[PDB]
Amino acid sequence: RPRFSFSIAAREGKARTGTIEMKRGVIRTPAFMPVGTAATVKALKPETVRATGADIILGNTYHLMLRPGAERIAKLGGLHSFMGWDRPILTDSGGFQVMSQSEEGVTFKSLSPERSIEIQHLLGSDIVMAFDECTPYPATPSRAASSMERSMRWAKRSRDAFDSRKEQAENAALFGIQQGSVFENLRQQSADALAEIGFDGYAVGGLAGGEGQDEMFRVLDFSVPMLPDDKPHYLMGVGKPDDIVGAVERGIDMFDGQAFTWDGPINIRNARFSEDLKPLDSECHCAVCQKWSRAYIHHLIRAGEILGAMLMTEHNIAFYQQLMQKIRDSISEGRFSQFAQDFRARYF
Amino acid sequence: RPRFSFSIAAREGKARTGTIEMKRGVIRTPAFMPVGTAATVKALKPETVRATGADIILGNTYHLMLRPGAERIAKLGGLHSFMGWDRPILTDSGGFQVMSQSEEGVTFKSLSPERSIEIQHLLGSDIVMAFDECTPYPATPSRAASSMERSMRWAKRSRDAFDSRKEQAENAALFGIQQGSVFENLRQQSADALAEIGFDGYAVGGLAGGEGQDEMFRVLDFSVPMLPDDKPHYLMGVGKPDDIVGAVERGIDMFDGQAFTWDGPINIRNARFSEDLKPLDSECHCAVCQKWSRAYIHHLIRAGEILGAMLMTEHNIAFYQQLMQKIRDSISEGRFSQFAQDFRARYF
Numbered sequence: 001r002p003r004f005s006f007s008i009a010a011r012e013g014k015a016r017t018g019t020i021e022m023k024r025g026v027i028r029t030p031a032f033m034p035v036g037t038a039a040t041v042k043a044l045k046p047e048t049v050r051a052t053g054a055d056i057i058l059g060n061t062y063h064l065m066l067r068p069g070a071e072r073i074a075k076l077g078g079l080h081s082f083m084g085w086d087r088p089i090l091t092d093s094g095g096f097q098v099m100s101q102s103e104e105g106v107t108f109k110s111l112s113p114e115r116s117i118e119i120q121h122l123l124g125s126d127i128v129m130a131f132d133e134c135t136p137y138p139a140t141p142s143r144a145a146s147s148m149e150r151s152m153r154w155a156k157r158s159r160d161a162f163d164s165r166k167e168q169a170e171n172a173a174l175f176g177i178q179q180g181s182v183f184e185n186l187r188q189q190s191a192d193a194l195a196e197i198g199f200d201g202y203a204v205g206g207l208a209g210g211e212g213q214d215e216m217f218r219v220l221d222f223s224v225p226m227l228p229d230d231k232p233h234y235l236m237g238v239g240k241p242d243d244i245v246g247a248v249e250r251g252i253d254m255f256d257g258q259a260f261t262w263d264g265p266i267n268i269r270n271a272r273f274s275e276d277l278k279p280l281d282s283e284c285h286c287a288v289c290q291k292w293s294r295a296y297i298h299h300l301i302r303a304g305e306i307l308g309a310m311l312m313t314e315h316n317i318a319f320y321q322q323l324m325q326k327i328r329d330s331i332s333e334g335r336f337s338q339f340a341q342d343f344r345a346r347y348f
Numbered sequence: 349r350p351r352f353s354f355s356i357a358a359r360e361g362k363a364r365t366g367t368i369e370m371k372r373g374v375i376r377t378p379a380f381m382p383v384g385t386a387a388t389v390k391a392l393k394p395e396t397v398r399a400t401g402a403d404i405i406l407g408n409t410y411h412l413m414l415r416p417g418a419e420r421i422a423k424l425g426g427l428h429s430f431m432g433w434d435r436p437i438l439t440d441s442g443g444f445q446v447m448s449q450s451e452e453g454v455t456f457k458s459l460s461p462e463r464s465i466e467i468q469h470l471l472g473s474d475i476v477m478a479f480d481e482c483t484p485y486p487a488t489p490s491r492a493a494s495s496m497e498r499s500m501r502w503a504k505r506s507r508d509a510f511d512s513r514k515e516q517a518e519n520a521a522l523f524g525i526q527q528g529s530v531f532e533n534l535r536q537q538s539a540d541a542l543a544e545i546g547f548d549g550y551a552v553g554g555l556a557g558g559e560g561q562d563e564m565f566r567v568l569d570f571s572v573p574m575l576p577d578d579k580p581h582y583l584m585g586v587g588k589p590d591d592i593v594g595a596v597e598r599g600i601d602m603f604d605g606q607a608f609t610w611d612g613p614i615n616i617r618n619a620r621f622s623e624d625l626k627p628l629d630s631e632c633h634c635a636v637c638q639k640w641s642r643a644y645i646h647h648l649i650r651a652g653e654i655l656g657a658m659l660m661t662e663h664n665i666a667f668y669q670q671l672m673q674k675i676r677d678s679i680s681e682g683r684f685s686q687f688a689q690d691f692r693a694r695y696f
């Protein structure tokens with residue numbers, strides 16, 4: 001395999017399906033990435049994560065740098081070896097979680113473009129995120145501009161740091177992050193700036209920050225076409241099943257007691273499930289739905305048992321992976337419009 | 349398979365190895381039973397429990413009767429179906445955890461011989477424990493006598509309740525519990541009384557209550573020979589690896605951050621493990637020791653991650669099952685004395 005090769009196999013309107021080939025594996029797109037916080041996808045062994053269909057997981061730089069530490073993970077062989085996941089890992093830059101300051105970077109109590117890229121290198125990340133400056137929502141045009149401009153300066157710094165490390169440049173990929181809040185002109189300037197520097201993929205940053213779905217979709221309508229068509233488009237911090245379907249309709253390729261079902265989410269703790277022998281979802285192919293009832297999982301979660309968390313998480317990630325598979329198949333078959341309509345009529 | 353058949357394949361001194369055949373499976377003895385509290389072995393799927401080598405698990409009547417409830421579990425198909433474990437289950441009587449009162453039974457804020465046997469029936473238990481009255485440690489001779497006598501009256505009541513339920517009598521087994529504190533004469537009276545009523549197996553109750561290993565072993569020295577030789581001997585609430593080895597030497601067949609190793613326990617949270625790439629134990633065949641380091645599990649437990657609990661528990665139960673296997677093989681091969689000596693020299 002190559003370091004990085006993104007190929008589009010099929011399109012329907014703005015939606016695309018294809019593959020990212022990397023040294024550690026192939027990523028099917030549109031892709032959903034389970035999140036590893038502190039070097040573990042919560043309550044799952046890596047083999048269980050894989051069994052759900054995930055091709056790639058996300059690691060959080062902010063949390064790993066604090067515990068157990070980036071240099072320590074490198075001394076132990078890198079993140080993949082440490083946690084036992086041998087396929088691609090995307091690492092965020094750490095910037096977001098710092099927020100949830102100067103032109104050089106940020107200092108905080110328990111980072112810079114250069115230090116973020118270095119930490120991601122020490123972890124052994126396959127997809128490295130440029131270090132950006134968070135724009136809160138809402139933001140005035142002046143402040144959104146100032147932060148976007150700083151982020152573009154930091155994108156160049158991130159590029160140059162990554163490139164100046166040969167092993168990283170040869171084995172990993174680097175994604176840039178579009179900023180600009182909800183403002184079309186600022187999104188355009190940001191896309192232009194990122195394309196001029198050149199990245200392996202382009203994230204839409206700054207959304208899912210409190211603006212609501214209608215507004216997010218409005219911004220995606222004009223923002224995703226600004227990005228290079230031939231590279232992956234990553235919507236950071238999204239999301240809910242319906243958000244994913246609408247974002248794919250707008251050209252996004254990658255994403256990162258409540259149980260998901262094709263009729264909508266349920267809260268398994270509710271008393272109505274105490275004697276319900278049905279699986280969490282009636283069609284779901286996951287191992288949880290094959291073997292255990294709603295009634296048992298209700299009991300486990302209300303009892304605070306670890307197995308409850310294990311079973312709920314495996315089901316939910318499997319559900320998301322089945323969603324992504326149905327999206328990929330429908331786009332490849334030229335019936336994604338109908339899938340999205342059918343999905344919404346029932347989920348709601 | 350029969351309802352119940354215990355066969356002794358080999359002996360060495362007081363130690364025995366053999367099998368209990370039941371409708372749901374064969375139990376290899378000496379046996380270690382993982383404990384299911386609130387219908388789950390903590391942090392493990394049933395298939396993982398089985399993969400460690402366990403033949404049988406323990407269910408706690410006190411906890412199940414409170415949450416989710418005995419009648420509810422019966423309505424849902426019984427404990428085996430509810431939790432997804434299809435092999436034998438031993439249920440305790442509920443009496444111990446009530447303590448941790450009258451001749452009819454006990455009332456408490458969140459049971460009788462008859463109600464305990466009924467709850468165990470509603471759960472679908474394969475091995476049912478008679479309902480006894482707990483003797484604290486230390487206990488005076490008068491009080492130990494009074495409680496033992498009450499327990500023997502309750503053993504007869506337990507017998508008669510079990511027998512008067514045809515489905516239970518035909519498909520499950522009933523074990524009696526020897527009491528008498530640390531007093532040889534009271535242990536003798538209790539053994540005699542239980543043998544006269546007749547049970548499928550005999551537990552040594554009332555130990556591991558604060559008396560310490562030397563005292564426990566002294567009591568086992570005279571108490572286990574009093575029980576019928578041709579039935580299983582169950583030491584309730586024991587225990588530590590060294591306690592198990594010495595108890596098997598005295599004729600026991602069944603048992604119910606710290607990681608066990610053949611060099612002794614370690615506390616994985618200790619800083620000395622933060623960069624230790626070795627598995628938890630150097631010889632252990634379990635999946636955890638095949639795949640993850642001490643350093644990773646150190647991190648997970650110190651971070652409060654659920655996967656830490658999952659991995660530690662799987663290793664520890666696998667360790668116990670490997671111990672039991674090495675005990676069974678050494679007795680069958682007539683080298684258990686040497687095993688016990690070798691085990692202690694290294695564990696300590």
Ligand SMILES: NCc1c[nH]c2nc(N)[nH]c(=O)c12
Pocket residue numbers: 092093094095096129132134177204205206207208209236237238
């Ligand atoms: N939802 C937006 C978001 C989530 N995580 C992020 N991490 C970074 N670096 N930038 C971003 O804009 C975001």
Ligand SMILES: NCc1c[nH]c2nc(N)[nH]c(=O)c12
Pocket residue numbers: 440441442443444477480482525552553554555556557584585586
């Ligand atoms: N360690 C003694 C013990 C543990 N659990 C028990 N449950 C019952 N019914 N009786 C007992 O003596 C014990």
Ligand SMILES: [Zn+2]
Pocket residue numbers: 280281284285286287288289290315316318319
């Ligand atoms: Zn499922």
Ligand SMILES: [Zn+2]
Pocket residue numbers: 628629632633634635636637638663664666667
């Ligand atoms: Zn192990």
